Structure formats: structure tokens, C-alpha cells
Symmetry: D2
Subunit: 237 residues, 4 copies
């Protein structure tokens, strides 16, 4: 399979696969069964913001999710990502719906990674920022049902011309350039990611969620990874 | 052909094709015959630094080149790059040698472009920084004789194991991700590029130069673009 | 007097002192009589965005102002700022009202300046970004009627508890740290500034405007610089 | 007293006050008796580089120190800095010598802090970078024996015209602008600091060290804080 590290904003509780009985944020190391979660007070049709951070000194992947006028949800996991991921990766956003559904709309997305060597001229850096998505976005790899340019937004899952979200949809956007997360001479490696998102549903139980993820470079949507599998995994192991 | 916008650090004067009778910095809009030049007091075997800047308000491509303890050379050209380049481009470094020769060594390279829209959440940004090049640099497209990882450096032209530069060599490094230089809703578009370079020759007349360039995305080394053509153009028109 | 370089978003036309007969953006070098202007299609109660740019290679102060869904206004002036300003400056925002009035509300403000030396370890940099102003903002010098923390915003001029703008008000916010705009070994010096602003008036003729400005470090509000003088100048010379 | 959080690069082992019996890096929370240390293989007269990182999600102050061609030393402490420091602080560098001595030379210094609110327009940011120190550096507060502009460098302790370090010297440089490390609406607060340093001594036992520190805004050199107290503390408690 692919190798996946994701932060999930998971909107539908699948307690059969270890989800808590509420919407939650999770940290996923090579399994959809989050290694850690925190309760998330999901707001239907409000624009929210996720922040992911990591560095190789502390080896802690943390995330925070918030809406304005609302308290934040936070989650952290101790994990050495050099022991998990290959030295070259792609970073991306994934989403899905199933028999339950929602809009999985990205309004903005930014990523910074730094590799600091032991030489005095130190940093190797990559940073992108999207506040505006464009019909033909050449620096993004779109997979499955992901489209760009509708209202300047990235629609990770299928949404009708009438505004209405479709079920059984899975989509992903990956930044075009590979990211280097380890180096021979690296003394500190850090990254950070922020995305803003609008999840709305005509339903009282929306599904299934959005993930920021890091994968191998040739990572693709796994077969039957709609719904609870979030476009990340081929099974619930 | 390809469409090329380059800043040349041109080490060999080819006065038959309009070069002045000294080493010079030039601004090249779709021709190796610089639209403007300034005298450059090239220092053999010293590490130098080039800076390129542009924005769409002023529509002026400027460049500066310097060595420590030395006065700078500067050059500027009025040019609307939206009238020259396609809206998606790749940016890169190119170099060549011919019957005369030199090391075309890049010690570091960084690039920032911003597209600011009229929406209040404004900037679309890309930034990379390389202070350290790596044997297998996946976020660079190497073309012709360009290699990476020798002393943590990008060698744009061929250099023997003994340190010694080879003639009749042409090489290019292009950043993997396309860069968006125009947008429907763009109010300001700007970029900047800095590279540090070591050009040394056993010869009193080194050749041929280094260029920072912007091209179409599928741009490749033109046939017989060794020597004076700098790996940029198929002819001296 | 103080030495002032400002970009004015000037809402009231004072044609007696050379204003055109419309709202306009201007570039002010040591006088309120803009050296250059462009027509500005000011929108009452809409949030707008100003961008200012400059570098010492081209020696061109340019500005753009925009609202979403609206075309931009632009203005540029050739001026060597090293010949105008001292080598250490403070940068800031100023506003005023007079017998005519408006809210002069800053929602956000960011500034970047770079001094690049000829040494290989090149950049001296300062960057700040405010998206949120706070009751007691210690890194801002507030002058005259400027306050912070009302709705997370900088109110440059006086505004009642009921939301309503007061006349004959002048205020300024200056960043606490001095900015270095020239250096012995400088090869390129550049800066950029962006602010977002909400100007609303119960009046069909609002007054008087907002300026981004650069001054000497001990710069203060000049006596009787309410109204057309924008909190920048002691007279209309 | 003042409130001090420092990362020490401590060159002289004072085992009477809990130093290990070697040069070491330490994390100092309101005491010179590091809460945690790691062995540091200090190199006399070689240029080294320190990196400090922290965020409020993980609440871990970490540091790394390195020389080229050398393995790094690392140290980390779990500490909520909002429980230690006031919401407004100054950040700085300090050094000292005593009966033993060394040059405490800063070649470069950069700092980034971010406060991310729960509003969609999120970040409040401050960043500075010094690669070049200047005779009259207005954006630095120099205290005790600190000077700037000798070889473009910050000399934290006294050094003769002949190059030679003086004993019983203490100096500090603080950035002029206060830094905001906590906010009402903050969801994540992070910072990072890097400085490059040259410590040389004619002595086989150099003293006493360099610290990156964060203090209250009106923090000053404590009386008799030369030598082992590093210009940070009034006593060894
Ligand atoms: Ca689920
Ligand atoms: Ca030539
Ligand atoms: Ca006016
Ligand atoms: Ca000690
Ligand atoms: Cl919980
Ligand atoms: Cl695609
Ligand atoms: Cl598969
Ligand atoms: Cl010339
Ligand atoms: Cl390749
Ligand atoms: Cl060809
Ligand atoms: Cl006009
Ligand atoms: Cl004040
Ligand atoms: Cl006065
Ligand atoms: Cl240890
Ligand atoms: Cl001082
Ligand atoms: Cl004291
Ligand atoms: Mn889950
Ligand atoms: Mn030429
Ligand atoms: Mn005017
Ligand atoms: Mn110690
Ligand atoms: Na958008
Ligand atoms: Na290198
Ligand atoms: Na605000
Ligand atoms: Na220096």
C-alpha cells in the first residue's frame, strides 16, 4: 500500500472502527484508527481552520482546529516521522462522503517545511500558499473527484451546480513538488500546514471528513476509500 | 521555440552578437542579444551573488550582481512579462561552456513569487530555498550536464572528479512545480530570485555564463546551445 | 518639520491644494500635494486593501488599492528614497477627519523590509503582521486619537461607542522598532506594506483619508493637521 | 527580580551550581541551574549555530547547537511559557566572561514569533533577521559591554582592538520591539530563534557562555551577573 500520515477532521463517528461517539480530530499513522483523538464541536456551514505542526527535535505531530467565536479542539501524538515516511514525500488534502454527505470545500491552504543543516548557510525551505484556486491549477495534482476554480475554491468532493453535496465521492489535491523531510546533515526539520474549510450538509449527520496528509510521492486514491476511509486507506486496519 | 526571459551573468564577450567587449550582466527577452547590459567585474574563483526582482505594477525586470568587498553591477529593463511569458511558467538556472570554459557552480538558490488578488484574503505565494543540493534532488528537473550533490552543490556544467571544468557543456536546473505569474483577479504580481555562484577557470578568458531564467513549463535545452547561447536559445537572433 | 513619504488614500477632494476633483490615491514626497495621483472609486462601508512597494534598484514607489469585485487603482512615482529619508525611519499609518468625516478603521497591517548586503550571508530583514489589534498593543506607538482593541481593530480616528465617526479627529499608529532603509554595504533595499481598511460615513462626502507613511523616528502629529493635512504635514505647501 | 527563560550555551562547568563536568547546552526557567542539559562538544574558534523552538500546543522549549562537520547537541524541556513569562516580553542575547574568558561574538541572529487567532484572518507575526550588525544599530538595545559594528558583528562581551577577549565582562542585545507571546483568541503561539556565534579563547578553559533569552520588557543586567551568572540572574538559586 501507500504510507500515510494524516490529521483527520472526521465528521462521522464510525465506532465499529474505534471512532469516539462524536465528531473528532485525529492523528493517523498508517491507519484510519487514529492513534489519538480529541472531541470536535463541528459547526455545519461555518468556515473553520486547521493547523498542523511538527519538528524532528521533539518528534510530536500536533493539530488544532477552530471556528471564530468558538473554543479550539487540539490533539498531539509522539511519533518520529523519519521512522514512518520516506525521505521524499508529497503533502496533500483528501476528503470523502459515503451514504452520508457534505461539502468538503477548501477556501485556502498553506504549507511551510524547513530542513536546517549543520553548515552555517543553513536552511532548505519550501512554502506555498493558496488563498485562491483557479480552474486549471498546474501546481496541484487533483485525484478522484477533486476540482478547483468553483468560486475560487478547491472542492475535494463532488458538489452539484445547485450548491448541493453528493454522496459516495472521494477526492484529493497534492502539491506538485516533492517535499524533502530528512537530509544527511539535518539538525532540525520542521513543517507546518494551515487550511481553511467549509463543511455543510442538508443532513444532521454529515460525513465523512477532511484530512491533511503526507504520503509517498506516487500516492493515489485507494480502491473503495470513499466514506469512512477518507480517501487515505484501502481498509480499516 | 521555447519562450525565454533570462538575466545573464555572461563571462565571455561575443561582440559579433552584440555583447559589449567585457564580462557583463544582461536582461534577455526572447533573444541572447540582451535588451540591456551593464559592465561586470567578474572575479575568477570568488563566490558571487545575483538578485533578480520584478513586479507587474512597475513592469521592470532588474538585477544586481556582487562579490564581497566589491562594488555591485546593476541592470534594468522596462518590460511587461505578462505580454511575453505564458501565465504558467517554470523558473530555472542554466549555464554553458564552449571552446572556452569554467565551473558553473551554484552554492544556493532561492525564489519567491506572490500573486495578490483583489479579495481581502489576498496572497497566492510560492517560495523555495536551496542552500544544500543533494545527490537525488527530486524537486529539481536537471537537464543536459547539470548534476547535484557534489560538495552539496549544483554543478550546471561538467566538472571532472579532479575539480577541473570541461568545455562544450550545457546544463539546466528547473524547479519541479510550475509558477503562476498571472491571475484573473491579480492586483499585484511580484517575484524575486537570488543565487550564489562560484565561476572558476584555469583560463584568463572563461566562458560562457550563468542565467537565471523563466520559461514555458516543458522548456528543454535547445540543440547546439552550448557556448554563447547559454543553454537558452537555438540561435543568436 | 518632520520628513514624510506617504501613500495617501485621499477621500475628500481639496482642489484648492491640487487634489483632482474625485477621491484618489496619491504619492506624497515631503508635501500633501501629491507628486502623482490616480482616480480612486472609493466604496463607502466596504473593506478595501492597499499595497505599497519599493526598491532601491528601480527607485520607484508604487501603490495599488482595491475592493473585491472591483477594478484596482494604481499610482507610481520615480523617487530615490535614500535622497529623501534618513537611513533610520519609522513606518506607520495616519488618518484624519475635519468638518467632513468617516471611520478610519484598520483591520490588518503588514510590512516587510529587506537590506541585502554584498556579503554572501546577505539579508537584513524586518517583518510584522497585524490581523488582530489588542487593547494594549505594546509594539505600536499610538498618537493623537488612534486607539486599538475595539473589535480587534485599529481606529485611527475617533469613533463613538454607537459606531459613529467623529469630525476634527487625527490619529497615527507607528511600529515601535526603527527600520533601517540604507546600509554601507547594501546592494538592494526593498520594502512592501499592505493594509486593509474600512472607511464608512453617514455622509455622501466623506473625509479626509488614510496614509501609509515613512518618517523620521521621533515623528509626531503636526499641529492643526486634522482634515486635509491627513495628520502628516503642518501646512499645504 | 526579572523573569528569565534562557537557552544557555554554557562553556565553563560550575559543578558547585549543578553544571555537569563539561561544556553543555541548558534550558533555564527562572534559574541558572538548568532544568535540563546535554553535553556540548564546544569547538574553540569555530563558528557555531544555535536553534531554539517552541509552541503552545506541545509546550516544549527545545534547542539544538551545531558546528559544520560535527554532530549536533540537543536539549528539550516540557514547560508552559504562558505560566512563566508575562504576555509581553523582550527577546535577546546575553553573554559573560569572568576570571576565565572568551570572545562572545554574534555573526547573525533571527527570530520569528506567530500568534494564530481563531478568526479566519489568523496570524499575528514578528520576524527579524540580522546578518550584519552596524555601528549604530537603532533596533537593538545594547546593555553592559555589548557593542555592534566591529567587523559587522555583535560583540556581547569586551574585546580589545588587538582581537583579544577581556574577562569580567557582561553584555546583552535585546530587540527594540516587544513581542506578544499570548493573546485572548490565540489557538497556537509559536516562535523560533537562530543565532550564529564565534567563541574563541587563548585559554584551554574558556568562560562563561552565550544565552538566547526571553524576559520582561524592562529587563536589565543584574548586579554581579558576570561570569557563571551569564548576565541573566542576580544569584545561583
Ligand atoms: Ca469516521
Ligand atoms: Ca557571451
Ligand atoms: Ca484631500
Ligand atoms: Ca557555567
Ligand atoms: Cl477529548
Ligand atoms: Cl490533475
Ligand atoms: Cl489500491
Ligand atoms: Cl555600463
Ligand atoms: Cl531529473
Ligand atoms: Cl530544439
Ligand atoms: Cl487617472
Ligand atoms: Cl502609546
Ligand atoms: Cl509641529
Ligand atoms: Cl547528555
Ligand atoms: Cl543602546
Ligand atoms: Cl539588580
Ligand atoms: Mn476517526
Ligand atoms: Mn551577453
Ligand atoms: Mn490628495
Ligand atoms: Mn550551565
Ligand atoms: Na478561495
Ligand atoms: Na551548497
Ligand atoms: Na482585526
Ligand atoms: Na556579521
Amino acid at each position: 500500500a501507500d504510507t500515510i500520515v494524516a490529521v483527520e477532521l472526521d465528521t462521522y463517528p464510525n465506532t465499529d472502527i474505534g471512532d469516539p461517539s462524536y465528531p473528532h480530530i485525529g492523528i493517523d499513522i498508517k491507519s484510519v484508527r487514529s492513534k489519538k483523538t480529541a472531541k470536535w464541536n463541528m459547526q455545519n456551514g461555518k468556515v473553520g481552520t486547521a493547523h498542523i505542526i511538527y519538528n524532528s527535535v521533539d518528534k510530536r505531530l500536533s493539530a488544532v482546529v477552530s471556528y471564530p467565536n468558538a473554543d479550539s479542539a487540539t490533539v498531539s501524538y509522539d511519533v518520529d516521522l523519519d521512522n514512518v515516511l520516506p525521505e521524499w514525500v508529497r503533502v496533500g488534502l483528501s476528503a470523502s462522503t459515503g451514504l452520508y454527505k457534505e461539502t468538503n470545500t477548501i477556501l485556502s491552504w498553506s504549507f511551510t517545511s524547513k530542513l536546517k543543516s549543520n553548515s552555517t548557510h543553513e536552511t532548505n525551505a519550501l512554502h506555498f500558499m493558496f488563498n485562491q484556486f483557479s480552474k486549471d491549477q498546474k501546481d496541484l495534482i487533483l485525484q478522484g473527484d477533486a476540482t478547483t476554480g468553483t468560486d475560487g475554491n478547491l472542492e475535494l468532493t463532488r458538489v452539484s451546480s445547485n450548491g448541493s453535496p453528493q454522496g459516495s465521492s472521494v477526492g484529493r489535491a497534492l502539491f506538485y513538488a516533492p517535499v524533502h523531510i530528512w537530509e544527511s546533515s539535518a539538525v532540525v526539520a520542521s513543517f507546518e500546514a494551515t487550511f481553511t474549510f467549509l463543511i455543510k450538509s442538508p443532513d444532521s449527520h454529515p460525513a465523512d471528513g477532511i484530512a491533511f496528509f503526507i504520503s509517498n510521492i506516487d500516492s493515489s486514491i485507494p480502491s473503495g476509500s470513499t466514506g469512512r476511509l477518507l480517501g487515505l486507506f484501502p481498509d480499516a486496519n
